């Protein structure tokens, strides 16, 4: 997915969502946010979507 | 030659949102010992669910 070769659709009915604000004049890659988000998903429950 | 300036009624920020904070403008009695106050979306409101 991180490479431009695969696209994923996740079927979630509803969920708690959080968000972050970034300065437009600062180049960045947001991969770590998703990565750590995945690092907390278990069959018991999931953290909020960033 | 006197000057007055009222504080504005609406929030003045880069981004303004609406959040659920019960009794945030309460003035009378202490009220029921029950409360619901979610944080702004920039935080994690899991603890409420």
């Amino acid at each position: 997915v991180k490479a431009g070769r695969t696209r994923v659709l996740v079927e979630l009915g509803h969920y708690v969502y959080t968000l972050h604000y970034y300065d437009p004049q600062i180049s960045l890659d947001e991969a770590p946010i998703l990565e750590e988000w995945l690092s907390k998903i278990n069959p018991a429950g999931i953290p909020p979507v960033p | 030659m006197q000057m007055y300036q009222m504080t504005p009624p609406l929030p003045e920020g880069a981004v303004n949102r609406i959040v659920c904070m019960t009794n945030w403008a309460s003035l009378g009695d202490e009220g029921r010992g029950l409360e619901v106050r979610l944080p702004p979306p920039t935080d994690s409101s899991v603890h409420a669910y």
Binding site: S39, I41, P43, A44 | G33, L34, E35, V36, A48
Partner: peptide, 30 residues
């Protein structure tokens, strides 16, 4: 304040019994 109470012990036990590791260490991960 807010209200929160623990679940039944049996429910907690079975739930905890199924918690695969989120991140593992394997030599083939791209």
């Amino acid at each position: 304040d807010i209200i929160t109470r623990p679940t039944s012990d049996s429910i907690a036990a079975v739930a905890n019994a199924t918690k695969p590791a989120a991140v593992v260490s394997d030599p083939q991960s791209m």
